[PDB]
Structure 1
């Protein structure tokens, strides 16, 4: 009993690790956005929605990690 509950909690912790990579990923996209906009002065009107797409996709990987963490934590 105790072991099964414990195991679930440990495993959830391991799953939390996955999220860090998505976090850094998001930052990288935003860094590129800033650098691009400073580079062009004018790419922004096209590029800004593109940047939002990239953000979401990077984020989605982190979402998968989180949901697996919840599946182990809550059951």
Structure 2
């Protein structure tokens, strides 16, 4: 039982690494939004909803990591 609990806790820590991908990805989307609006201010209403979509889909990959993390810690 000591070994299994220990393994759950190391596994939980490892499971958060993947979150770096969403941290970077979310930023890449918003950088594009900002550069896109600076170059063509009139496009704002068109690209803003695209940024929201991109951020959310990128963020979901981190959510999956965090889900495994919580399953290990509790489930």
Displaced runs of 4 or more, over 2 A: none
Secondary structure at 2:10's aligned position in 1?
A: helix
Return the offset for 1:46: 1.1
Q: Measure the CA separation in 1 of the matches of 2:5 and 2:47.
A: 48
Unaligned runs of 5+ in 2: none
Return the offset for 1:42: 1.1
Give the paired residue count: 75
Unaligned runs of 5+ in 1: none
What CA RMSD, in Å, does the superposition of the two structures yield over aligned residues?
Answer: 0.7
TM superposition score normalised by structure 1: 0.95
Q: Measure the CA separation in 2 of the matches of 1:21 and 1:74.
A: 24
Return the offset for 1:73: 1.2
